[PDB]
């Protein structure tokens, strides 16, 4: 029977929408290397994408489905996926509610101390990308850390996580607050570099116009 991945259905009814717990999902089977397909949904149970087939068998709820295909696609045919780090797993966590609180207040007194909240939790997580971790620090003879994602230099669970959020903070507080992810912070950069380099990543996410719209009525002006 197999796998089937159903995601958000995207505003034109085609594409794939706005969903980062759609992506994250995407992202675990593509790295996983297992055979599967992926449908956009609408709904119009009932369920809310995303949810998958595993032959036939219906799953839901993000968390447990990740467990799920992380404890059954397992070696030797199948890569592990779980960060071996603990602090990798929290690494960043508080963004996309500091981000959400930032884009949906509307009144002008409470913008700063808002905007300083995203970016101090923005902050937190380039200093765990610059920490370097004990298998890095084992192979020099702190000089900051040079591996590429979360974990160390593959993608992880965490970084399927992560990786998705990250996408919708940058786009949609730029495109509703004229808010950049701040330019010293080269551990963060360092970390959206490498991810957008890959394939699995990048053609996971939900285009720049589709993200922007789905926040037209979520993200607010400010009075």
Same mark, same amino acid.
């Given at each position: ?50 949810? %998958?087939?595993?032959?036939? &068998?219906?799953? @839901? $709820? ?5 467990? #799920? *295909? ?62 370097? %971790?004990?298998?890095?620090? &084992?192979?020099? @003879? $702190? ?5 590429? #994602? *979360? ?73």
């Amino acid at each position: 029977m197999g796998i089937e991945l159903f995601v958000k259905a995207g505003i034109d009814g085609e594409s794939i929408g706005n969903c980062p717990f759609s992506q994250r999902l995407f992202m675990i089977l593509w790295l996983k290397g297992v055979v599967f397909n992926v449908t956009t949904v609408d709904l119009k149970p009932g369920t809310h994408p995303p949810f %998958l087939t595993f032959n036939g &068998d219906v799953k @839901t $709820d993000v968390n447990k489905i990740e467990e #799920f *295909l992380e404890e059954t696609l397992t070696p030797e045919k199948y890569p592990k996926l779980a960060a071996k780090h603990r602090e990798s797993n929290t690494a960043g966590i508080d963004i996309f509610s500091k981000f959400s609180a930032y884009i949906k207040n509307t009144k002008q007194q409470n913008n700063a101390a808002l905007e300083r909240g995203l970016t101090k939790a923005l902050k937190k997580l380039d200093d765990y990308l610059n920490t370097p %971790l004990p298998e890095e620090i &084992d192979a020099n @003879t $702190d000089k900051g850390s040079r591996r590429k #994602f *979360l974990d160390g230099d593959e993608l992880t669970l965490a970084d399927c996580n992560l990786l998705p959020k990250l996408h919708v903070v940058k786009i949609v507080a730029k495109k509703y607050r004229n808010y950049d992810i701040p330019a010293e912070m080269t551990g963060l950069w360092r970390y959206l570099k490498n991810a957008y380099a890959r394939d699995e990543f990048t053609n996971t996410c939900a285009a720049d116009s589709e993200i922007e719209l789905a926040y037209a009525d979520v993200a607010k002006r400010l009075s």
